[PDB]
Motif scaffolding. Structure first.
Motif, PDB file in Angstrom:
ATOM      1  N   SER B  24      11.674  -4.385 -12.153  1.00  0.00           N
ATOM      2  CA  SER B  24      10.850  -4.944 -10.977  1.00  0.00           C
ATOM      3  C   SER B  24      10.843  -4.129 -10.048  1.00  0.00           C
ATOM      4  CB  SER B  24      11.670  -6.392 -10.670  1.00  0.00           C
ATOM      5  OG  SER B  24      11.840  -7.038 -11.839  1.00  0.00           O
ATOM      6  N   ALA B  25       9.457  -3.199  -9.946  1.00  0.00           N
ATOM      7  CA  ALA B  25       9.220  -2.144  -8.755  1.00  0.00           C
ATOM      8  C   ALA B  25       9.102  -3.131  -7.699  1.00  0.00           C
ATOM      9  CB  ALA B  25       8.064  -1.495  -8.824  1.00  0.00           C
ATOM     10  N   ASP B  26       9.787  -2.551  -6.272  1.00  0.00           N
ATOM     11  CA  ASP B  26       9.463  -3.201  -4.860  1.00  0.00           C
ATOM     12  C   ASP B  26       7.979  -3.471  -4.961  1.00  0.00           C
ATOM     13  OD1 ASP B  26      11.052  -0.359  -3.826  1.00  0.00           O
ATOM     14  OD2 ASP B  26      12.276  -2.203  -4.021  1.00  0.00           O
ATOM     15  N   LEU B  27       7.328  -2.387  -4.885  1.00  0.00           N
ATOM     16  CA  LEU B  27       5.830  -2.539  -5.011  1.00  0.00           C
ATOM     17  C   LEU B  27       5.110  -3.776  -4.133  1.00  0.00           C
ATOM     18  CD1 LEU B  27       3.772  -0.957  -6.040  1.00  0.00           C
ATOM     19  CD2 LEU B  27       5.672  -0.247  -6.963  1.00  0.00           C
ATOM     20  N   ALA B  28       4.659  -3.071  -2.869  1.00  0.00           N
ATOM     21  CA  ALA B  28       4.103  -4.045  -1.885  1.00  0.00           C
ATOM     22  C   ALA B  28       3.148  -3.230  -1.127  1.00  0.00           C
ATOM     23  CB  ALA B  28       4.954  -4.722  -1.122  1.00  0.00           C
ATOM     24  N   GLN B  29       1.925  -3.655  -0.965  1.00  0.00           N
ATOM     25  CA  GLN B  29       1.033  -3.019  -0.109  1.00  0.00           C
ATOM     26  C   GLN B  29       1.555  -2.873   1.153  1.00  0.00           C
ATOM     27  OE1 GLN B  29      -3.095  -4.418   0.513  1.00  0.00           O
ATOM     28  NE2 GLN B  29      -3.472  -2.842   1.728  1.00  0.00           N
ATOM     29  N   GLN B  30       1.487  -1.707   1.910  1.00  0.00           N
ATOM     30  CA  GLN B  30       2.294  -1.533   3.200  1.00  0.00           C
ATOM     31  C   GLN B  30       1.184  -1.406   4.289  1.00  0.00           C
ATOM     32  OE1 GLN B  30       5.850  -1.976   1.568  1.00  0.00           O
ATOM     33  NE2 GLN B  30       5.609  -1.054   3.622  1.00  0.00           N
ATOM     34  N   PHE B  31       0.123  -0.811   4.402  1.00  0.00           N
ATOM     35  CA  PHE B  31      -0.967  -0.591   5.005  1.00  0.00           C
ATOM     36  C   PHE B  31      -2.276  -1.119   4.728  1.00  0.00           C
ATOM     37  CE2 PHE B  31       1.939   2.403   7.734  1.00  0.00           C
ATOM     38  CZ  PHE B  31       2.442   2.897   6.873  1.00  0.00           C
ATOM     39  N   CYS B  32      -3.089  -1.249   5.756  1.00  0.00           N
ATOM     40  CA  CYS B  32      -4.465  -2.038   5.316  1.00  0.00           C
ATOM     41  C   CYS B  32      -5.669  -1.579   6.388  1.00  0.00           C
ATOM     42  CB  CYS B  32      -4.321  -3.331   5.161  1.00  0.00           C
ATOM     43  SG  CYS B  32      -4.014  -4.486   6.561  1.00  0.00           S
ATOM     44  N   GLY B  34      -7.973  -4.287   7.360  1.00  0.00           N
ATOM     45  CA  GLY B  34      -8.490  -5.717   7.177  1.00  0.00           C
ATOM     46  C   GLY B  34      -8.512  -6.440   6.019  1.00  0.00           C
ATOM     47  N   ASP B  35      -8.158  -5.932   4.981  1.00  0.00           N
ATOM     48  CA  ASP B  35      -8.095  -6.432   3.442  1.00  0.00           C
ATOM     49  C   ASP B  35      -6.602  -6.467   2.908  1.00  0.00           C
ATOM     50  OD1 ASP B  35      -9.600  -4.642   0.952  1.00  0.00           O
ATOM     51  OD2 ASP B  35      -8.573  -3.982   2.826  1.00  0.00           O
ATOM     52  N   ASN B  36      -5.821  -7.339   3.097  1.00  0.00           N
ATOM     53  CA  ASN B  36      -4.440  -7.113   2.474  1.00  0.00           C
ATOM     54  C   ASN B  36      -4.565  -7.730   0.849  1.00  0.00           C
ATOM     55  OD1 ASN B  36      -4.784  -7.995   5.165  1.00  0.00           O
ATOM     56  ND2 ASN B  36      -2.654  -8.932   5.211  1.00  0.00           N
ATOM     57  N   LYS B  37      -3.596  -7.391   0.205  1.00  0.00           N
ATOM     58  CA  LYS B  37      -3.707  -8.265  -1.223  1.00  0.00           C
ATOM     59  C   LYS B  37      -2.463  -9.108  -1.113  1.00  0.00           C
ATOM     60  CE  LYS B  37      -1.088  -9.093  -5.256  1.00  0.00           C
ATOM     61  NZ  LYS B  37      -2.352  -8.808  -6.457  1.00  0.00           N
ATOM     62  N   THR B  39      -0.012 -11.501  -2.845  1.00  0.00           N
ATOM     63  CA  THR B  39       0.306 -11.486  -4.056  1.00  0.00           C
ATOM     64  C   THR B  39      -0.085 -12.876  -4.889  1.00  0.00           C
ATOM     65  OG1 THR B  39       2.585 -12.357  -4.593  1.00  0.00           O
ATOM     66  CG2 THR B  39       2.513 -11.157  -2.733  1.00  0.00           C
ATOM     67  N   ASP B  41      -0.857 -14.985  -7.131  1.00  0.00           N
ATOM     68  CA  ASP B  41      -1.486 -14.579  -8.472  1.00  0.00           C
ATOM     69  C   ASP B  41      -3.027 -14.524  -8.231  1.00  0.00           C
ATOM     70  OD1 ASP B  41       1.099 -16.449 -10.225  1.00  0.00           O
ATOM     71  OD2 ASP B  41       1.307 -14.618  -9.081  1.00  0.00           O
TER      72      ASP B  41
ATOM     73  N   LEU C 249       3.334   2.154  -0.991  1.00  0.00           N
ATOM     74  CA  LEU C 249       3.704   0.999  -1.523  1.00  0.00           C
ATOM     75  C   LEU C 249       5.087   0.495  -1.598  1.00  0.00           C
ATOM     76  CD1 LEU C 249       1.108   0.884  -4.581  1.00  0.00           C
ATOM     77  CD2 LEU C 249       1.130  -0.497  -2.336  1.00  0.00           C
ATOM     78  N   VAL C 367      -5.990  -3.040  -3.148  1.00  0.00           N
ATOM     79  CA  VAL C 367      -5.863  -4.322  -3.355  1.00  0.00           C
ATOM     80  C   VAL C 367      -6.519  -4.655  -4.642  1.00  0.00           C
ATOM     81  CG1 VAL C 367      -6.190  -6.594  -2.245  1.00  0.00           C
ATOM     82  CG2 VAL C 367      -6.673  -4.330  -1.097  1.00  0.00           C
ATOM     83  N   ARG C 378       3.459  -6.126 -13.658  1.00  0.00           N
ATOM     84  CA  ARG C 378       3.899  -5.073 -12.988  1.00  0.00           C
ATOM     85  C   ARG C 378       4.850  -4.288 -13.607  1.00  0.00           C
ATOM     86  NH1 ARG C 378       6.715  -4.907  -9.488  1.00  0.00           N
ATOM     87  NH2 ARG C 378       8.575  -6.359  -9.417  1.00  0.00           N
TER      88      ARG C 378
END
Lengths: 415, 48, 413
Positions: B24-32, B34-37, B39, B41, C249, C367, C378
């Motif tokens: 399970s990677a931490d893996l999470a968008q950090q900078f952007c 105007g368009d985040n992801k 999560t 699903d 990330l 994204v 993942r």
């Protein structure tokens, strides 16, 4: 994206990174400033004397650069050569209309005061002079560049040239590697002479003394590798210069390209100053260098390698370029050219062949648009055939030095 | 490697922890810009 | 989870662990304090003498640092160089329109009293002086850094530079590895000179004496590796600096990144003091160092390696970072860039090409990919894994503790 926010807490971050500079300097944008190339051949003592100071200093193992420069100017003021047509570059009118001119008709000033041994050395040496001594001096410039045992490969020929008139031999004893004469190339005045000689005999190609070009030649286009690689690319694909250009497929190669083809720099000119921009000190950062054209240099050489260049297996692999994309683009170019033979009947005896007569079958000719499109169709990912093509081009290469794009290519394609 | 500890169980426990973190990677968008992801699903033997 | 209980007996345990400190110090947040960088060039005796004490001390095998500093200040007070435009950094106004300034226009104080040999050494040496002797002295700073046999690689060139004007040779005899001059870099006053010289010729790029930059250059951005790796990452993926940022990330890389891009530190400035923050002693713990930016450093270098960097196969592998996750993130980035070629027709002759499930995203968008990655549970797909293998196998000659060797163990089994 002038603006970047950090999601966790909506604060702005402003990505910036260290400034780099080394802007290039073109030749033309220099004959704006000056309108002459100054050659500070200093002391003006007897040639007979100078012939001495060197013939000694050489056999010795040390001799002032200042002296050799002076000696050269001495034995080279042969005002030989009659202007075939006219001659001018960058505004400077070098000669005209049947004029008679000599090498140093490229701008002499004198300077300084201090020297070495007194007035008059060992008279022992005569006019076994012009003939061959200058050639040696100039010859060393070439030898002074290569950092490798190949140097003694050149010096070998560098004297088995030599042997013409008098049949002499070695002069120093100490190999090289930077220390001996290998540093003459650092003397802004020395180089200026080498350039002037080369540029001169490139014009009077036919001239008893034009043999001096040996070793004076590696100054022509010094630090202009990118221009050369572009020339080889054309020769090696069969394509025209304008067609090759259209096959450029990534911005920073186009950037690079645009930079090299800046107009009014006389690069397509027969005998201009442009080729010697470095050694006459017209420019201190060449626009045409391989290091200021990395992306192009990589792309051009990789492609040529896939197309079977021998030259290219030993080119250097630049740093800080976009490899993956640069090489995908190269592969495609190489594949296109590689599978579509020019192939067209050329001579006949009354009966020509008129060429007249799918989906994933790739384009017929060598057109960027047809291929780009075909490539889209392929999910912009190299097909197994291309990959096969690459393998059969790089496997069976042996003896690869590291950091060459030969070795890069073989690692990428022949697993 | 210490002596007189309960190896088998100690290492089963270690493996699990390592496996959890390891897959399970931490893996999470950090900078952007105007368009985040956002999560937003395997249901059984697919692990947490 | 400010609160943890032990199930067996419902007692509270309070997990804590040893405090670590080394907070960084930025350059700006220093020209708050002082407004000058003090250079204690001490004794002020004859240059002719000093030229002596060194030329001797050198050939000898020992010479006071105090003396060489003084000599340098001596031969370097060439007030050369005419200000092209204006010049100022961190509030300090170094020069102005048209002005003429020299190297040491960066803040001289004098001090102490004690020295070595008396008044006047061996007159034997003349103005084979400025020309080349200082260059040597400065040259050695560079040579004094590398801990490896490569040093004699530099010294070689370090003198085959040299040979210009008089053609001399070696001076010490003793190798190095720290003992000889290799410790000059420990003299807060020495470095301050090296920095002032480099900073100076970086501005007057074109100047007969700008050759001195040799060996004085490895002080520019000393202990600022992270900034450099970030630069390489952009160059090497083709992405903009803001786009590369969005591909970060994991928190502690973003943390690190935020720390490096703190504003008003002049990092994007042409010629500021910032690049020499260490050698002018503006800061004693660089914010941009690779060790204070470990996560970033790893991620950036690993990714660059998957993308074919040569530089990156030899980077050091930090300790105490979250490897597994850091590398999963790197792989993805590398895979995205690695399979989507920029690829776009650039020149033409009247006819352009208009480009008009588990297949991965088209371009290089965080994204799109994050989402595609979710879809993949993942967990890296076999192709990614294959990509990695073909990027790391065929790497040979790998030093241990490098992220080259790390990468090859992880991917080419």
């Amino acid at each position: 994206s002038v603006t970047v926010k950090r999601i966790i807490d909506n604060t702005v971050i402003v990505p910036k990174l260290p400034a780099n500079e080394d802007p290039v300097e073109y030749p033309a944008d220099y004959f704006r400033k000056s309108k002459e190339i100054p050659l500070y051949i200093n002391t003006t003592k007897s040639l007979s004397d100078l012939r001495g100071y060197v013939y000694q200093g050489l056999k010795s193992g040390n001799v002032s650069i200042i002296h050799v420069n002076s000696y050269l100017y001495g034995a080279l003021k042969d005002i030989r050569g009659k202007l075939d047509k006219d001659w001018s570059s960058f505004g400077i009118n070098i000669g005209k209309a049947g004029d008679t001119i000599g090498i140093f008709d490229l701008v002499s000033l004198k300077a300084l005061d201090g020297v070495l041994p007194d007035g008059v050395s060992d008279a022992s040496r005569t006019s076994a002079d012009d003939k061959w001594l200058p050639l040696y001096l100039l010859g060393l410039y070439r030898v002074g560049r290569t950092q490798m045992p190949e140097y003694r490969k050149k010096l070998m020929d560098g004297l088995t040239n030599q042997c013409k008139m008098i049949n002499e031999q070695f002069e120093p004893l100490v190999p090289e590697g930077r220390d001996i004469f290998d540093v003459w190339g650092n003397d802004s005045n020395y180089t200026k002479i080498v350039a002037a000689v080369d540029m001169f005999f490139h014009m009077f190609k036919k001239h008893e003394c034009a043999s001096f070009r040996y070793g004076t030649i590696v100054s022509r286009f010094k630090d202009c590798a990118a221009l050369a690689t572009f020339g080889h690319l054309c020769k090696i694909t069969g394509m025209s210069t304008e067609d090759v250009t259209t096959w450029i497929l990534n911005r920073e190669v186009a950037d690079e390209m645009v930079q090299m083809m800046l107009p009014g720099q006389e690069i397509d000119k027969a005998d201009s100053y442009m080729p010697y921009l470095i050694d006459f000190g017209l420019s201190s950062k060449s626009p045409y260098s391989s290091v200021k054209n990395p992306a192009f240099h990589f792309w051009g050489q990789l492609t040529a390698l896939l197309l079977r260049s021998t030259r290219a297996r030993n080119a250097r692999q630049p740093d800080d370029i976009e490899y993956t994309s640069l090489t995908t683009a190269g592969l495609l170019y190489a594949y296109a050219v590689g599978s579509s033979a020019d192939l067209a009947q050329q001579f006949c005896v009354g009966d020509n062949k008129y060429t007249p007569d799918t989906t994933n079958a790739p384009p017929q000719g060598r057109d960027v648009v047809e291929w780009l499109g075909w490539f889209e169709d392929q999910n912009r990912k190299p097909t197994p055939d291309m990959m096969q093509y690459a393998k059969r081009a790089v496997m069976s290469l042996q003896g690869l030095r590291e950091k060459t794009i030969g070795k890069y290519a073989k690692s990428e394609f022949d697993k | 490697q210490p002596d007189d500890i309960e190896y088998t169980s100690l290492t089963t426990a270690g493996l699990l922890y390592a496996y959890a973190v390891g897959s399970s990677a931490d893996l999470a968008q950090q900078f952007c810009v105007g368009d985040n992801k956002y999560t937003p699903d395997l249901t059984t033997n697919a692990p947490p």
